[PDB]
Amino acid sequence: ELVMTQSPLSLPVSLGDQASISCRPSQSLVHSNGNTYLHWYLQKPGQSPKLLIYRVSNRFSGVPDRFSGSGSGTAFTLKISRVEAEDLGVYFCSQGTHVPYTFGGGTKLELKRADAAPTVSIFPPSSEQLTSGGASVVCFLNNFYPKDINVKWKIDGSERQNGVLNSWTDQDSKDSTYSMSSTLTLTKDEYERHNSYTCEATHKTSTSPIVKSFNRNEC
Amino acid sequence: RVQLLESGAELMKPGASVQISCKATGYTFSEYWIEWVKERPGHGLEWIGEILPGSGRTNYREKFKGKATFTADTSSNTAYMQLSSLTSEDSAVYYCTRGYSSMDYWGQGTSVTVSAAKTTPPSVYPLAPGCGDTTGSSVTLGCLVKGYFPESVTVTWNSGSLSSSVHTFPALLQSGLYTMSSSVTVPSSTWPSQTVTCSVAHPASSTTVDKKLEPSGPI
Numbered sequence: 015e016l017v018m019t020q021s022p023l024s025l026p027v028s029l030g031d032q033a034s035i036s037c038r039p040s041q042s043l044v045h046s047n048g049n050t051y052l053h054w055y056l057q058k059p060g061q062s063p064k065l066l067i068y069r070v071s072n073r074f075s076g077v078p079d080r081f082s083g084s085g086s087g088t089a090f091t092l093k094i095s096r097v098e099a100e101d102l103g104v105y106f107c108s109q110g111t112h113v114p115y116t117f118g119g120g121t122k123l124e125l126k127r128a129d130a131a132p133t134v135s136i137f138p139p140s141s142e143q144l145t146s147g148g149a150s151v152v153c154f155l156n157n158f159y160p161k162d163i164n165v166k167w168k169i170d171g172s173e174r175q176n177g178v179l180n181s182w183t184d185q186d187s188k189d190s191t192y193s194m195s196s197t198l199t200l201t202k203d204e205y206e207r208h209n210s211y212t213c214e215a216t217h218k219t220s221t222s223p224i225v226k227s228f229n230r231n232e233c
Numbered sequence: 234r235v236q237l238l239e240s241g242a243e244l245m246k247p248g249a250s251v252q253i254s255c256k257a258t259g260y261t262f263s264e265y266w267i268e269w270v271k272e273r274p275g276h277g278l279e280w281i282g283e284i285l286p287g288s289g290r291t292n293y294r295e296k297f298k299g300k301a302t303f304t305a306d307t308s309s310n311t312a313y314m315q316l317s318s319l320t321s322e323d324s325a326v327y328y329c330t331r332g333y334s335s336m337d338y339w340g341q342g343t344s345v346t347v348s349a350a351k352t353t354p355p356s357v358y359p360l361a362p363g364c365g366d367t368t369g370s371s372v373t374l375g376c377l378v379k380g381y382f383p384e385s386v387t388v389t390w391n392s393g394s395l396s397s398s399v400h401t402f403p404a405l406l407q408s409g410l411y412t413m414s415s416s417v418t419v420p421s422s423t424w425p426s427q428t429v430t431c432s433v434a435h436p437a438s439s440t441t442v443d444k445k446l447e448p449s450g451p452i
């Protein structure tokens with residue numbers, strides 16, 4: 015059905031900056047009635063989406079003037095002539111022309127700051143936990159920027175994908191930074207079969223991972 | 234003022250049916266479609282369907298036919314969505330929205346969590362350096378707050394340590410159970426010289442667990 019491709023998935027801006035979000039629907043959105051049901055929403059964290067612009071270019075009541083939309087055929091743009099704090103969130107285009115109504119994947123409008131590398135901290139399973147037959151290895155990757163980060167776990171130098179649960183905070187209100195934990199969960203027995211436990215963070219600020227590591231036998 | 238008031242959070246056994254309500258006030262209810270939309274982390278906004286109260290005209294997103302049922306009572310001004318055969322894939326926030334040409338007003342959303350689990354207080358595991366390291370000038374500590382149900386929990390560090398040095402990692406639902414963590418960073422001039430404690434409130438089990446952070450091994 016109607017795929018709505020929004021780029022970019024992430025728009026860092028400084029407040030006051032202009033912002034442009036593209037929405038490329040996979041077909042024209044002109045209804046038989048001649049209207050074009052291309053709309054734009056914002057959802058802020060903790061909140062429900064809200065309509066911003068309906069039928070390509072009309073601003074829904076109460077929507078700030080700095081918001082305008084344009085486009086036609088398969089290219090539609092939301093524009094925020096000057097990004098203000100209140101405008102931060104996930105913007106979604108949407109076509110209401112064809113059933114089923116669809117939405118773009120979202121564009122997260124957030125604050126741009128200087129690239130920052132993660133402070134990586136790795137912790138072995140606690141004795142409290144191991145006592146119960148579980149073993150969670152935790153890696154905090156704190157206060158980095160941009161949001162994009164890739165974390166690789168290695169157990170004795172071989173990558174481990176399974177067991178890994180990653181959780182990002184949302185953008186820090188104070189430093190515009192992101193954090194994430196990555197938890198590698200094993201049985202005590204899996205855990206106890208190996209020595210070298212490595213959390214590797216790949217991020218923009220680095221042409222090679224931040225590697226954080228422990229050996230079970232030194233811990 | 235157009236308001237759509239949804240029913241409260243649902244905790245549902247797999248296989249159960251839930252019926253979400255949506256109370257529409259501020260306008261003429263049988264004049265507008267009510268849309269139902271699904272939002273599930275990492276799945277953007279997925280339309281489920283619509284119903285036109287009074288006329289019972291519905292549209293359903295294809296793969297929701299057989300799963301979602303919409304009903305609307307023009308007398309109560311309430312629309313309802315039933316979802317039957319609940320599985321972990323249906324764990325999401327559901328929205329009703331007023332629809333006509335866009336989805337111009339949304340409900341606050343209804344969160345549905347599917348889970349077999351009994352109310353489980355979290356196991357709380359300290360995350361402190363060990364492994365024979367020397368601390369830098371700052372030390373990152375944490376608590377891994379594992380296997381609870383339901384949401385949510387509150388991690389608080391020495392009561393007022395969100396000074397702010399704290400990262401709370403949103404909880405992730407994994408096999409009907411939750412795990413979150415929380416990091417804190419303090420100068421090592423302060424730790425372990427002084428007491429750092431994570432206090433983990435799990436209201437839903439009338440459970441609070443304080444865990445003193447101590448070196449997990451030689452430092």
Ligand SMILES: C[C@@H](NC(NCC(O)O)Nc1ccc(CN)cc1)c1ccccc1
Binds near residue numbers: 283
């Ligand atoms: C009035 C509205 N009709 C309608 N359903 C009719 C039906 O399928 O039986 N609902 C509808 C359409 C789009 C949206 C949008 N984002 C919300 C509700 C509509 C009709 C014709 C063109 C465009 C919109």
